[PDB]
Amino acid sequence: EGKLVIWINGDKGYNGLAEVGKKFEKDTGIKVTVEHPDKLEEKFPQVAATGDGPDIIFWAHDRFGGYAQSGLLAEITPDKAFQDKLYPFTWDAVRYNGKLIAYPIAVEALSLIYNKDLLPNPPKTWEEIPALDKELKAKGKSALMFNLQEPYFTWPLIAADGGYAFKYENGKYDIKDVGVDNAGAKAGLTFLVDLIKNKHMNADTDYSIAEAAFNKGETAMTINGPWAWSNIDTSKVNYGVTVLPTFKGQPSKPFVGVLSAGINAASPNKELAKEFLENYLLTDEGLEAVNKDKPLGAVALKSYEEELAKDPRIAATMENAQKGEIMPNIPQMSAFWYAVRTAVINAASGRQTVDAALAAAQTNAAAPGLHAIYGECRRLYPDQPNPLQVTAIVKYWLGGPDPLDYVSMYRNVGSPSANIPEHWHYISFGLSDLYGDNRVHEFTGTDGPSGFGFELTFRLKRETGESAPPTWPAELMQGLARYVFQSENTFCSGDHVSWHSPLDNSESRIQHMLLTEDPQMQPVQTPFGVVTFLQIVGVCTEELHSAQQWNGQGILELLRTVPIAGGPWLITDMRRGETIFEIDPHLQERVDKGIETDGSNLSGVSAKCAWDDLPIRTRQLESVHLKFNQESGALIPLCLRGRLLHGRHFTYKSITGDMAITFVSTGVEGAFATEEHPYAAHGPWLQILLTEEFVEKMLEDLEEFKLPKEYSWPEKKLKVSILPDVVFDS
């Protein structure tokens, strides 16, 4: 609005910012409003585009990387006079792609917390701690307790001797160069595991146990961030905060994240914001104002840190902050976090060796999505670690024709007791985000769908004495997958696919597909999003038609009741010769009611038909004669009962013509047919409006008699005929 609006999380000191907003108002006359709405990090991309976003946004740098790739943040341009007021490394935290995208405001870092009563002189090295633990154990106490389930707290030691996630040499992160496999990480984890083996620590320890312990006076030491402190103050423990122990002569690295403020690229007032950020907020007065209201922690302005630095506590956060590394901004951080955590836990529980866990972890950070899926696959099929797998040798993102990188092929023995035949279970890989580096699918985050948000599956009844699963279903999946990408049609459980081809290139009656949720596969959380599994179900042309006329869900249920045609898990039998309706005539009945009580999903059809026609004008007619093929005539009840009685339109379009006939219900909007003038036409396009009573009467009248079939009324006539449309006499 030419005024400055700021959105920030509910915890920090906005009133101080409001005071700075008042100070802004005094010196410049511009009103500064400060609000702190919920879930802002998610909201900013959503509203930033419209223009109702804030001019300035405050948050830890880790989000900003996402914001920067989406193009929501403006480049900031501070003079050297300014960049020198702040520490060089805080600027590093705000560089993406070599550009500066925010003013660093506050830095948070983990530190070593000790009880002054128990340990007057804290250890300067980790190697001392065992003996110290032994000493503390001597008086019924333990030395150290911290979260071993989350890598944020164990990474310093893992990072201590040379380990790293990504190295940025020019402000740009090399995503290939991962450092979870080197001697250092291995050194740290063996040491952690060794600490746990010698019962100096317990793999079970969590936030609350560690916190309860220090606050109750049960344990001697901890590692934590500023937020925890408030709770220790209430505990009245006399404690000091200092630098973390060194390992093998090198500093521990605690991830340091700096609260920063960025300027919205869609803001008119970018320069006002720059003036404000550089000359008012980043001053002793603005920061002091904010500090009194709610402490920021260790600030980024050298001058101000010195004022704050007497707090032994602040000193330690900044000592640790300088000694530690800055969090990466790329989205793959999410991938790193899942890998490590599993590695640490597995190494600590004895499930895996240190070398193997970190070796496994380095690799899993590369293609997490594939693996996460492999996880779900592993839960169902522990018996089959390696299944026959079709690989696309020419990868899609290098110009390849096949978008599914892998299709795994399993043998499911089934359950005879549940009437589930033995079958082959195909799972696809590529529709979801496997790699998460933007090679095929744009990265979206943990929230929201990974890639298209699903993978395809298929269940093919095993023929007797078949040694191996056939491969044609993979080619089918590739076909569908291409459609997904090109077609950009939504795929949800219940949707149908018109193929018109043998699914397996045989003479089978199964020539179409319906889609449903996989019976036994549960969806998964991959760092790049959520993945669900859509199973393909082979159907006959008649069954597809029923699905179109009613809905997919209903026909799926019908397929579940007839075991040969699907059963509870919907196994496709290509060899199947009968439709579900030929097997049980009463199923047709269930379909008709569904159409009655649900309406029909068919908005129109392409068929042989015509009406009497003849720079364009909307004509009105008092007489109308419609002509239909037997095939289209058959749908007239559906057109009337299914749509008009539910206030829904229906459209016939001529295969051979530009003619069209749209049956219109009352309450439809946008028709040029009125109750006053029911029959009207625009060029070859005809709309006819029918009142519900008339519709009911017509329905009674239509019901075998020899073609041609003629119906007549006091205003309109109808004919059903066959080859006349196909072949004219003139």
Author numbering: 5 to 618, 625 to 713, 720 to 746
Describing publication, verbatim:
SUFU is an essential intracellular negative regulator of mammalian Hedgehog signalling and acts by binding and modulating the activity of GLI transcription factors. Hedgehog signalling plays a fundamental role in the control of metazoan development, cell proliferation and differentiation, as highlighted by the fact that its deregulation is associated with the development of many human tumours. Here, the crystal and small-angle X-ray scattering structures of full-length human SUFU and its complex with the key SYGHL motif conserved in all GLIs are reported. It is demonstrated that GLI binding is associated with major conformational changes in SUFU, including an intrinsically disordered loop that is also crucial for pathway activation.
Although the crystallized protein was intact, both SUFU molecules in the orthorhombic asymmetric unit show no apparent density for the C-terminal domain residues 279–360, suggesting that this region of the molecule is highly mobile. Since disorder often impacts crystal diffraction quality, we generated a new construct (MBP-SUFU-Δ) in which these 82 residues were replaced with a shorter seven-residue loop. This construct was expressed and purified in the same way as MBP-SUFU-FL and crystallized both in the presence (crystal form I) and absence (crystal form II) of maltose. The fold of MBP-SUFU-Δ is essentially the same as for the full-length protein, demonstrating that the disordered residues are not critical for protein folding or overall stability. Collectively, these results imply that the IDR in SUFU is dispensable for GLI binding and repression activity in cells without upstream pathway activation.
